[PDB]
Structure formats: structure tokens, C-alpha cells
Design a protein around this ligand. Structure first.
Ligand SMILES: NC1=N[C@@]2(c3ccc(F)cc3F)CO[C@@H](CF)C[C@H]2CS1
Length: 373
């Protein structure tokens, strides 16, 4: 209902992620930790990397326990590796609890830490199935729910704005002040990533008319650790062709659509009106029932004279609903009921003509056929 102490507990810089303050060990060691719904490991810098403001010093903790196991995490854009162990963890601007959690002490990395950022670790909030080295390594939120009376739910309000960013991570609840209108739920298809099903796509109310399996090839996920709205290659081509057609009053280079170049207008003269709204229809809670979420160019044209980057991009890992999607909405990760809720965010960026929207119910048949196998 109301969680005043957790409101505004997220900070960051544009394109550098959202972080929360955490404490590790005894006596407590304060660290800034990136909130990531796209991964499942709690991993912190444990060595004096030059980009880091601070790091986990295991030698100073009386509650530190060594698991005597390594962890190696290569991924597409980089890699991190470390040493597994446990320790006492708390969230100063969160629930009044202390938990014994798995912690990967980062001992080597490449393109993981950001030069100029104010975070030193990552909080993977997804499920055990995608945890490294395997699903036997219990993620943080699972340890939290198991050892305390904290309800199995968390919500995110990412507000956006190198300009400073803010938001709220409500642990174990929902804060009704952070959204307007009603919450609409989409089922979590499978507990690994926060996997969802997109059943329809519209550009200014105009349907893309693609086989809905294309929207979810090979999956659709909700990821706070990603900036862009990432679309499968075939869907991106069709969406761009439709966005270019809708905004044809002004012509832009082909490189802009691919994120290779920026577009500039004289300060305070950005023509938001010429850019279309983008709607994603999501699988509802009832058979043949869907709802839709709508974003504005204020969410997908990102500030870098006012210059902008097109923050919709092509993907080979499926649909990624990153910060572009999440900044328009209050997102409820209702783990207890295996569903994700969306509502219009009380902090989303809009104008006097259009606002972000969450609407329903809509009749959509064969929604289960939209999922990739
Ligand atoms: N959702 C993602 N999280 C990862 C990530 C996110 C932000 C960041 F600053 C650094 C990262 F490494 C961590 O988990 C990797 C998977 F293990 C994937 C990457 C990229 S996308």
C-alpha cells in the first residue's frame, strides 16, 4: 500500500543503469549495486579495479564464509569471474531485515564495470534456472523470501531524467502513489528470465500484421539491466518501415534508425508530434483476453541544440523490454502469483497532447500460439 522509506531509493546516470544502496558483511560495508531483472547472480567487485569507488573487502568481515567454488560468467558484451561465498546482506532503504546470501566476489572482468559509473556490483533479480554456475546457487530474492516474512513480490518505478536518473524499488509490496489508473497483469510464461508473450504490435494504432510468433522469437523478457527496447530482426525491420512512414514530414539518414548517427533540433523545438506512439499487446490473465501498453517518442528517442539517439534496436535473443519500456510504467514483479503487472507511471515523461497508456480488455484469439517452442 504505502512504503515511504523505499520511495526514491534508486539512483544512476543516463545509460549507466539504476543502482540501490546495499550493505555486505560484519561490520557493514556500503556498496552501490545495479538492479538487474535480466540475470540471477549477486556479484560485487572485490578487488581495486581503477573504475571502482569502493569494493567488497572479505578480510574485514567476521560473518564471511568461503564456499571454495569459482564462477565464470562470459556474456555477449563482456565477462566477469569470481569466488563464491556467503555473508550478511541488508538494504538500508528497504525492509528492516538482514539475510545470509550467496555473493560472487568479482576477481577478474572485461567490459563489465563502467568508467565513470557510481556502482560496484550487480543484483540479479531473475530465477535460479539462469544462475551461474547452475540452479543450485540460490539468488538473493529467493534467500530474502525464505529467511524473512517479506512477501514474494517487488515492484519497479524507473523515472529516467550526464543527467542523473532516479526511481523506486519497492521490496515486498506495491506503493499506490507511484501509479495512476489500474494495474493489468501478464502471466510469467516460465520462471527463468521474467518471460512474457506479446500478442500484437501497433505503430500509431496501425497493426504490424506479422505472425505473432515473430514477436516472441526466441523469447520476450522484461529487463531493467537493458537500456533499449530490443526487437527480433524481422519485427525491427517492419516497425522501422512503419515508424519512417508515420514520421515522413521530416527526413532522417538511414544510419539514425540503426543507432549509428544522432538527430538534432534547436533547443526546446523537438517535434514530438511527428513521431508515432508504439503499442505492445500482452497476453492477459483470462483466455482470449489481452491488454495493451503504449509508449511515446519521449521514451524511445533518448537524449545524448537538443540531440537524440533512436533507442529501439534489433536483437538475436528475442524481445527485450528494457528502460525504453520500463520508464513509461510502474512494473509489479508478482512472483507469488507468477505474473507481471503494468500501470501508467506517475513519473513518466509526456506532453500536453499524449501520455503513456495501459488499456484493456481486448479480445485476442490463439494467444498461446504466439509463444516460441
Ligand atoms: N540484463 C543484462 N545483464 C548483464 C549486465 C547488465 C548491466 C551491466 F552494466 C552489466 C551487465 F553485465 C549481466 O548479466 C549478464 C548475463 F549473465 C548479461 C549482461 C548484459 S544484459
Amino acid at each position: 500500500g504505502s512504503f515511504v522509506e523505499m520511495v526514491d531509493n534508486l539512483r544512476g546516470k543516463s545509460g549507466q543503469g539504476y543502482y540501490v544502496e546495499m550493505t555486505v558483511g560484519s561490520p557493514p560495508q556500503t556498496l552501490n549495486i545495479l538492479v538487474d531483472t535480466g540475470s540471477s547472480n549477486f556479484a560485487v567487485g572485490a578487488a581495486p579495479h581503477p573504475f571502482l569507488h569502493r569494493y567488497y573487502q572479505r578480510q574485514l568481515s567476521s560473518t564471511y564464509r568461503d564456499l571454495r567454488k569459482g564462477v565464470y560468467v562470459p556474456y555477449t558484451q563482456g565477462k566477469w569471474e569470481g569466488e563464491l561465498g556467503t555473508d550478511l546482506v541488508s538494504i538500508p532503504h528497504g525492509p528492516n531485515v538482514t539475510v545470509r546470501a550467496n555473493i560472487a566476489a568479482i576477481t577478474e572482468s572485461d567490459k563489465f564495470f563502467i568508467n565513470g559509473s557510481n556502482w560496484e556490483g550487480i543484483l540479479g533479480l531473475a530465477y535460479a534456472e539462469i544462475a551461474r554456475p547452475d540452479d543450485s546457487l540460490e539468488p538473493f530474492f529467493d534467500s530474502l523470501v525464505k529467511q524473512t516474512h517479506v512477501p514474494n513480490l517487488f515492484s519497479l518505478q524507473l523515472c529516467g531524467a550526464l543527467a542523473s536518473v532516479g526511481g523506486s524499488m519497492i521490496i515486498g509490496g506495491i506503493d499506490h502513489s507511484l501509479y495512476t489508473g489500474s494495474l493489468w497483469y501478464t502471466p510469467i510464461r516460465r520462471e527463468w528470465y521474467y518471460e512474457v508473450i506479446i500478442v500484437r504490435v501497433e505503430i500509431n494504432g496501425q497493426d504490424l500484421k506479422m505472425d505473432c510468433k515473430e514477436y516472441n522469437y526466441d523469447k520476450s523478457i522484461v529487463d531493467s539491466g537493458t537500456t533499449n527496447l530490443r526487437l527480433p530482426k524481422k519485427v525491427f525491420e517492419a516497425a522501422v518501415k512503419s515508424i519512417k512512414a508515420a514520421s515522413s514530414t521530416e527526413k532522417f539518414p538511414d544510419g539514425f534508425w540503426l543507432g549509428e548517427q544522432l538527430v538534432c533540433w534547436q533547443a526546446g523545438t523537438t517535434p514530438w508530434n511527428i513521431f508515432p506512439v508504439i503499442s505492445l499487446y500482452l497476453m492477459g490473465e483470462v483466455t482470449n483476453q489481452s491488454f495493451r501498453i503504449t509508449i511515446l517518442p519521449q521514451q524511445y528517442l533518448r537524449p545524448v541544440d537538443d540531440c537524440y539517439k533512436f533507442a529501439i534496436s534489433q536483437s538475436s535473443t528475442g524481445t527485450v523490454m528494457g528502460a525504453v519500456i520500463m520508464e513509461g510504467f510502474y512494473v509489479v514483479f508478482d512472483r507469488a502469483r507468477k505474473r507481471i503487472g503494468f500501470a501508467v507511471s506517475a513519473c513518466h515523461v509526456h506532453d500536453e497532447f499524449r501520455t503513456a497508456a495501459v488499456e484493456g480488455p481486448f479480445v485476442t484469439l490463439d494467444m498461446e500460439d504466439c509463444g516460441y517452442n
